[PDB]
């Protein structure tokens, strides 16, 4: 029958290690580590892509409408974050390479670099990084590197529906947003307004003091910020500046899911939202762990790929790269439990 | 002798007071929040204990007897193993949702991490330079002392200045290097001006001194030479464990920073753009602590800038080769 | 106004470090590491017990009947396993202590040992480690050397309903089992009998002779599932823990995990197995460290790393009865 | 005409190596992809470990280890190996996100392949120094050849052993470590006994007498070479008597500059034994959850077989662990 090595196509996987330093005369030992590490990173990128595309597809073909599929969705998104955790740890292996030893074979790498990784870009795009999110240096050089089939795939990963878009769509349909029905946004606006009013009255009742004038201008801030939730115009504007990415209505669904997460239909949807955030944090921690290491390897030296090196990479560690940055920023609009619109028997049984 | 007593659990496990409970309605997750901070502080105390012992080994002259290097490197390596665990330990508090956090957050004000003594002592003792309003009494004293007593950076500095091979009438490392790099650049020409400007700027002692004042550089010129010496000649028996040490010093900076960052990533989910109870902008202020401003041993990182081809490095004659044996 | 140090009762937490080597006249540096390491473990044991008891109570008081509470239940159990992961990794810190240095203060410890950790014992008990299944130490019972208040506390933790019993009871009410309802078990036996017969008929059509014994073993194993007396017997030998009906609920939740009412239940079951693996991995890392430090004792430890201490063995063993997807009784 | 990332790493090979048997045989099962990637990633890291380990064997085999400027390279690489194994132990957490139920949906397509047929895992076991008694029909052709070479060539065990046998300080007319250690331990015991002969008759004194006699037998058994030879023949010890002395010398005097890095080396070798068994163990915990008591595709009983690989039988460097049986109070260590 079938055999381990053949099953895993190790004729390919373990015959894929060519040390350029060797190829050009003086074999440097640690180059082998350098090569295996990147390869393992790339096997796992492939796997993440496999999970990610499968989940995207579940949204794109409508299967997500059937809630029996949510366990699968969340399991696979959570798997993506478990893999990234491993990927963030994996840097510790390459760190057993001194900059001194790296330097003995680095010259045989130029002009290649990780910038040319097709899979990393597919992953960035499929999650939903937009070109106008990318660092100046990055949004005019990332795609200018690939051709033929590879260019085709990069193109498709920007042209096809991203995780962000697909989640946005499904978030807009979140039960309870319907004005006819539960009218979440209206109640919420009502309760926050009533809530802030009571608060102001409590503060005014206070014995005129140093601490009081503090509470007032502090209250005025919280009122300014909370009420601005309901300013759809401010949202379009923030959208246009790219400080925000989700539609206004999707954002309402997300917050619906936050406040009412313990309702049975919202439990797994809430886990999904948590996973999306986790994936963003891990993606950024990857970038950040990447930066720390490149610093020790290159110092101030420019990259083999022609970027500034340590300084360019440090600018990718930034919320401009957080695809689901909104999901984090909903914590700005957290209110006291009591203000959350109460839930009646019939929308509970729903 | 009994486990509980030995460990003084009568104290350790009776130190958990949920404010939410003290003010009427106990919120479950406050307990997690308390336990996590306590574990962190226990580990801060342990790091302080390793760190002070290493500082003392430099300051009392024992680091001069090289048989103590195994002790030094191990203890420094231990600090980094603890920090590594401390970085991972945020994963526990991340099982608290922002919502649930938001249920007891009100009872915390105005306490915050800003008032953690040990974290401050740790930063000063390593050597973060100031260029405290939260502390007073015996705590304000300790803090002053930790700013005033010699830091890990100063002690390591002194020691690095005494590195074998730097003396000009001896192996004269620094003079040869300048000769070799210069021939090397010239040779390459006949076979650039950017790295040439960059390489040669290493030999500008006064440029160095300038950046020292602005603190964009941190080690003395001499200490910098010693570090470079240990990097290049790291396989020489006397340089092996010292080189491990330099590596650890850099390990500790990355871990410190990874800590600040993991902290930031979690505070971002907890607060969004809410101000911190301690009065910082929150997310944004902590974001600014993730910069080489706080990287005490930047120089060791930045020495990677000046790496050269092996051939250029001043070959070591048997005089000094033998000098560098145990 | 509230201050960090006071809030955290740091006046206690950070004043709880007495090096016995120092108290006896020669401070040995690494005893500090030894003391801090244990205090952190115990701090996390207290947290685990805190989560663990709130969850037992959610079960014991009936709240778990309201399925809105499952997210909270599963989050806390998952959180227990996240702490346990850190605790497993935490041995790496103590592994920076050499056996030679450990040897310089070991004498000052005696007769204290980990055997005396009140919290480690409460944890074992509250999850559901059975006493009559405990490997005896020094020909005696784990509770013997505890006394007074602590002894009572352990008694209570032995007698009070454990996680295992609480989950068991909830598993017995799993929707689907009822004979006059979806009749899960009845249908399962029928579908397994049909599957096997179809399987047998195909094999008729040396490498053939393998499948025959291979089938015969599987036939015997699968059909043994519907033998309740064999179950009851293995129960009493402590080789199974869950009642027969509870088992049915667990297999119900495995097979139909994607059904929305079963999604978070399935996560919980997975968490319970997680907690079992993490406890065992904790005991193993312990063992591996002792070996290097010290060279019963190390023997008793190595003997705890076994399915004797695996409170939810039944959940692992269900994997034995996995069947092809299309044998699973369909849902109307 | 320009080195490119994908060419350099030959991803034309690495990322075209994923063929789901379930897909090949008519119904694709999503999670098989994970099973495959997980295994390929382990094998890339096995290859990397082989690479490090062979280079270190060669520094011993060709004598470069005699020149102590190379010890930093030796320890760094051995340490690198345990860093890789730490990651490989952690990597199970990824496969653990596959439920047994989903695994069950494609398991049938794997028979009769198994990890028993992992060439590299066996090469690894062998080059470290796992003995064939302390335990390959699954192999053929060139692979079977490599396997045999890995059995006959010097293992890291034998190479480390020879080097231990040359540890400075052992020589009888020199520092005479062994003779001094035996003399000092004998005096130390005699004295401590006298101290016990002083104590007033009690149940306590009797417990110290009984304790003493137990220590005394263990410590003095160290200077019994014939006992060591017997145990060696049973395979309960692996190192020669002299290598044993050399390791103890390095333990006791580890802070002496010439012994600092060697000490680090001995620690790494123990690390690597520890991590291998942790690997074997996390593998066991996972396989349990997938199979229960079902027999493996490779033909073993599965969960139950793998459990028996988790034992100091497979610890190549047991002697290094067990030397801590013979720790003595610092006063007794012969001075310099
Ligand atoms: C010695 C180790 C490493 C060095 C010196 C290094 C250096 C760099 C540099 C300088 C860049 C910026 C582009 C350039 O100027 O070349 C870069 C980008 C990149 N590298 Fe690395 N790297 C290392 C390890 C790795 C590893 C292990 C991976 C794993 C796949 C990786 C993947 C990437 C990716 C995906 C980018 C583009 C990231 C972005 O644009 O946001 N690198 N690297
Ligand atoms: C939900 C969890 C946490 C939140 C929301 C949080 C939030 C914050 C914020 C906003 C600050 C800036 C000071 C302020 O404005 O109050 C801060 C500082 C700080 N926090 Fe936390 N924190 C959390 C957990 C922790 C933990 C577990 C520790 C462990 C000891 C910690 C230690 C510190 C330290 C040492 C500082 C001073 C940081 C510096 O000066 O660089 N925090 N934290
Ligand atoms: C140098 C490290 C350690 C050594 C040498 C050691 C040694 C031992 C030994 C020999 C026993 C068996 C009972 C006895 O002979 O007294 C034991 C039991 C135990 N130790 Fe450790 N231990 C170490 C670290 C730790 C740590 C860090 C913890 C964390 C709380 C711990 C907790 C325990 C527990 C809970 C038991 C009882 C285990 C059971 O009954 O299954 N130990 N230890
Ligand atoms: C669902 C996951 C897995 C299952 C069910 C499983 C099952 C088994 C079983 C039953 C055996 C014993 C031989 C047999 O009867 O087949 C075995 C051996 C082995 N497997 Fe796994 N395995 C899994 C994952 C892995 C992974 C990820 C690796 C990494 C390369 C691996 C590598 C090995 C190796 C090297 C052996 C030989 C071990 C020895 O004999 O000491 N397995 N496996
Ligand atoms: N600064 C935090 C408050 C906080 O997290 C905290 C409160 C009391 C004791 C420790 C805390 N954590 C500090 O980093 C906040 O404003 O959310
Ligand atoms: N049986 C142990 C006792 C011990 O290690 C110990 C003593 C005090 C506190 C914790 C300890 N370790 C427990 O596992 C020994 O003989 O080393
Ligand atoms: N599943 C349904 C309803 C829905 C949309 N978004 C949701 C979020 C949570 C719960 C249910 C939903 C749909 O896709 O249209
Ligand atoms: N960009 C790296 C070189 C590099 C890192 N990873 C790579 C992978 C393949 C080729 C080159 C690289 C540098 O400038 O030093
Ligand atoms: N240990 C000696 C010599 C020394 C100083 N700095 C060093 C750095 C590396 C090696 C040796 C040294 C001393 O402290 O004076
Ligand atoms: N919630 C109901 C039904 C129930 C029991 N066990 C379950 C397991 C999974 C799903 C639902 C249930 C109860 O507590 O009785
Ligand atoms: N390096 C020398 C001396 C030596 C042998 N074993 C050692 C152990 C520790 C220190 C030195 C040695 C050799 O290999 O022959
Ligand atoms: N041995 C496993 C199957 C398996 C695990 N890992 C593999 C790698 C390749 C082929 C088969 C396998 C079983 O009995 O279920």
Author numbering:
A (entry chain A): 39 to 388
B (entry chain C): 40 to 170, 181 to 240, 257 to 391
C (entry chain D): 39 to 243, 248 to 337, 346 to 382
D (entry chain B): 38 to 172, 181 to 381
Question: What is the paper's account of this structure, in its own sentences?
Answer:
TDO and IDO are heme proteins that catalyze the oxidative cleavage of L-Trp, the first and rate-limiting step of the kynurenine pathway for L-Trp catabolism. TDOs are homo-tetrameric enzymes with 35–45 kD monomers and are well conserved from bacteria to humans. The hTDO monomer has an all α-helical structure, and the helices are named αA through αL, as in XcTDO. The heme is located at one end of this four-helical bundle, with the proximal His328 ligand coming from the C-terminal region of helix αJ.
